[PDB]
Amino acid sequence: LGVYLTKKEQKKLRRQTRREAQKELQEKVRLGLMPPP
């Protein structure tokens, strides 16, 4: 059994997926975990 989802549920998922990742990386450079880009 499978659910599909619409265009607007792709954006929201793609953006809220991307946002969490980049901001988490942002702190890593602040905290000095990661050499600064």
Add this chain to the structure above:
RNA sequence: AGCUUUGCGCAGUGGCAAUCGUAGCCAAUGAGGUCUAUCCGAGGCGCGAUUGCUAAUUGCCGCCGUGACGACUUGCAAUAUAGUCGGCACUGGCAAUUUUUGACAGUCUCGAGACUG
């Protein structure tokens, strides 16, 4: 035991300039139709931000000459140099052949010599 094809997720590489989102609405109970209408087939409207940055940037080393102190070598004007060494004083002097602060271009001949701008 390899190969192919579809969807999603995570990355690297190339190109394009309108994208993205909606606690708002309408929409297979049919959104939208200039074309063929007993036809087509899925988003449209309204609103707001391409979204964060990076590049940052600007208003103390030599000689000679003179004076004199001390010391040594010898006769002392009661009186200081007869000669040598040590150092101080002088907006003193110093730079066109011999040797450490000054000359280049090329040819030929037997380290040297001759010539050619």
